[PDB]
Amino acid sequence: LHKEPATLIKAIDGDTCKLMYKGQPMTFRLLLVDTPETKHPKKGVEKYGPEASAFTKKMVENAKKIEVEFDKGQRTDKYGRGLAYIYADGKMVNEALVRQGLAKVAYVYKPNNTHEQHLRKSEAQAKKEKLNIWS
Ligand SMILES: Cc1cn([C@H]2C[C@H](OP(=O)(O)O)[C@@H](COP(=O)(O)O)O2)c(=O)[nH]c1=O
Numbered sequence: 001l002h003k004e005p006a007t008l009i010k011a012i013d014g015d016t017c018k019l020m021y022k023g024q025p026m027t028f029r030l031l032l033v034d035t036p037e038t039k040h041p042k043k044g045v046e047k048y049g050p051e052a053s054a055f056t057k058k059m060v061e062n063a064k065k066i067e068v069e070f071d072k073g074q075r076t077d078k079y080g081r082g083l084a085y086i087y088a089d090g091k092m093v094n095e096a097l098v099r100q101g102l103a104k105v106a107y108v109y110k111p112n113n114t115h116e117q118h119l120r121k122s123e124a125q126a127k128k129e130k131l132n133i134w135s
Pocket residue numbers: 015016029030031032033034035077078083107109112
């Protein structure tokens with residue numbers, strides 16, 4: 001895996017954002033995780049959804065540097081969203097959210113799962129501490 005620079009364009013929710021990547025604006029969806037819905041009517045505003053959005057927004061807007069790290073499989077999902085691990089000043093947003101109990105490890109599709117065990121150990125810790133989603 002290799003990290004590449006990106007420039008924040010707009011934070012959308014806990015797990016989706018818009019970034020300028022390789023010269024063009026693209027919406028990215030965080031790999032291996034799922035923050036609660038705050039948009040789609042079929043799910044409604046789920047608990048911790050607004051919390052997850054806020055955590056992400058703060059984290060990416062206050063960063064000096066943002067980097068995207070694609071995994072080894074497909075780089076986009078069916079909606080044309082970039083699939084990656086996003087780092088804010090060297091800290092992985094995907095893991096950060098899981099650690100706070102603001103996201104669950106989900107959508108584990110091989111071979112896009114390099115950081116699965118890392119994120120899982122952080123989720124176990126959040127559960128163990130009964131944080132947010134786990135309370
Ligand atoms: C994170 C991720 C999401 N997705 C898909 C699965 C879901 O499709 P469906 O929309 O058919 O359920 C949707 C979940 O994203 P959201 O959490 O943004 O909804 O995006 C992938 O294709 N691969 C992934 O790695």
